[PDB]
Subunit: 203 residues, 2 copies
């Protein structure tokens, strides 16, 4: 039995070739979605017994878990197209620390340096749907993955603010936290190659 | 008078088209090299009066300085080709926290999450030359930028360890910290485009 955790920041298209790869080698494979904000908190629970976590969230060393980089993926800062700074420049990008942010909350009230909110006026949600609902309704601005925002950007229901900060969108590493056991395993090596190959194709 | 700080992690080839761009707009331009480990510590000193810092080091917010991403650049973990884990796998990559690391030190004894050493057995230096001297002499392993390591990798005087962690080498963002003053300036916007254009060409 192999258990795999995928934070909601990872495109669901990723989970395709990946899950196929694992089934050739492993006979039972369990896939768990979680908020990026809960990804690492979850695998630290001993009882949870996750073998592999695939999340954008970072920490320097977890107990009995090694880390490596599968690839890279783009998030964007998005708001209502009539938001106070809807198209304003690098000036209004400093100002985001003043305007209301819609951030992922976490079961453990704590947030990593990466995922911690930037502004004082913050309002927490559990998932990127709940996030972009409030952001579509001008309640605030938020950072969501490409795959969530591509749809609504076409339709002009949402506007990007990040481009002057990071053109192409905000590149962020996809990490793979694996039980130290899987380290000397041909099984895992084979999954790593495929998983990496995969994320390359999505940009 | 414009003052610009470039950490030693930035290729010196970058500083070419960049310095040219600034001179069209600005009439006096001063370029300062510094250790990545001293980059941010230096601009926080009020008396230093840096207008623009270009460094790989990250912090969520400095006083009276906005941040943005110029581009991306690759560092590699390097050691002696006969180092205990000279070609060993993802197992020996966990083990780096045990073997002696050669790390950049800092005037302020403190290090950011990014640049802080990973292992217990650490030995500090001021620059990447002093680093790769000790690493060529098998004293330990270290993380240096591509441009420092390309030379010695050809010659087989150094070996890579990072590939199983991050194939292609360890991607790291080049940040641009700028005095909030430069925000509403055509001068700076023009430099940003060129500087970004530049780093794209180096990979
Ligand atoms: N303008 C402009 C750009 O300046 C910014 C720099 C960092 C930011 O972080 C906000 C943080 O509270 C949440 N956060 C972070 N980094 C993420 C990366 C990927 C994904 Cl999928 C989500 C997040 C996220 O949800 C915000 C603005
Ligand atoms: N195997 C393997 C790979 O796993 C590692 C992950 C992070 C590491 O950081 C070491 C840190 O003490 C210094 N450090 C960091 N990140 C850098 C990025 C760019 C540049 Cl130019 C230098 C550094 C650096 O000098 C080491 C290994």
């Amino acid at each position: 039995n192999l258990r795999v955790l995928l934070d909601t920041a990872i495109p669901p298209s990723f989970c395709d070739t990946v899950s196929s790869v694992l089934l050739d080698d492993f006979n039972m494979v369990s896939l768990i979605r979680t908020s990026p904000a809960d990804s690492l908190a979850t695998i630290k629970q001993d009882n949870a017994e996750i073998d592999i976590a695939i999340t954008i969230d970072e920490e320097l060393k977890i107990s009995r878990f090694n880390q490596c980089v599968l690839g890279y993926t783009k998030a964007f800062v998005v708001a209502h197209p009539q938001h106070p700074l809807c198209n304003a420049s690098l000036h209004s990008i400093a100002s985001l620390a003043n305007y209301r942010q819609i951030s992922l909350g976490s079961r453990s009230g704590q947030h990593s340096n990466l995922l911690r909110p930037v502004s004082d006026k913050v309002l927490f949600v559990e998932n990127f749907d709940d996030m972009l609902r409030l952001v579509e309704a001008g309640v605030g601005w938020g950072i969501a993955p490409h795959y969530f925002v591509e749809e609504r950007l076409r339709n002009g229901t949402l506007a990007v603010l990040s481009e002057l900060y990071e053109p192409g969108g905000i590149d962020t590493k996809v990490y793979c936290y694996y039980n130290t056991a899987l380290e000397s395993e041909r099984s895992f090596l084979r999954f790593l190659e495929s998983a990496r190959q995969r994320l390359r194709e999505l940009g």
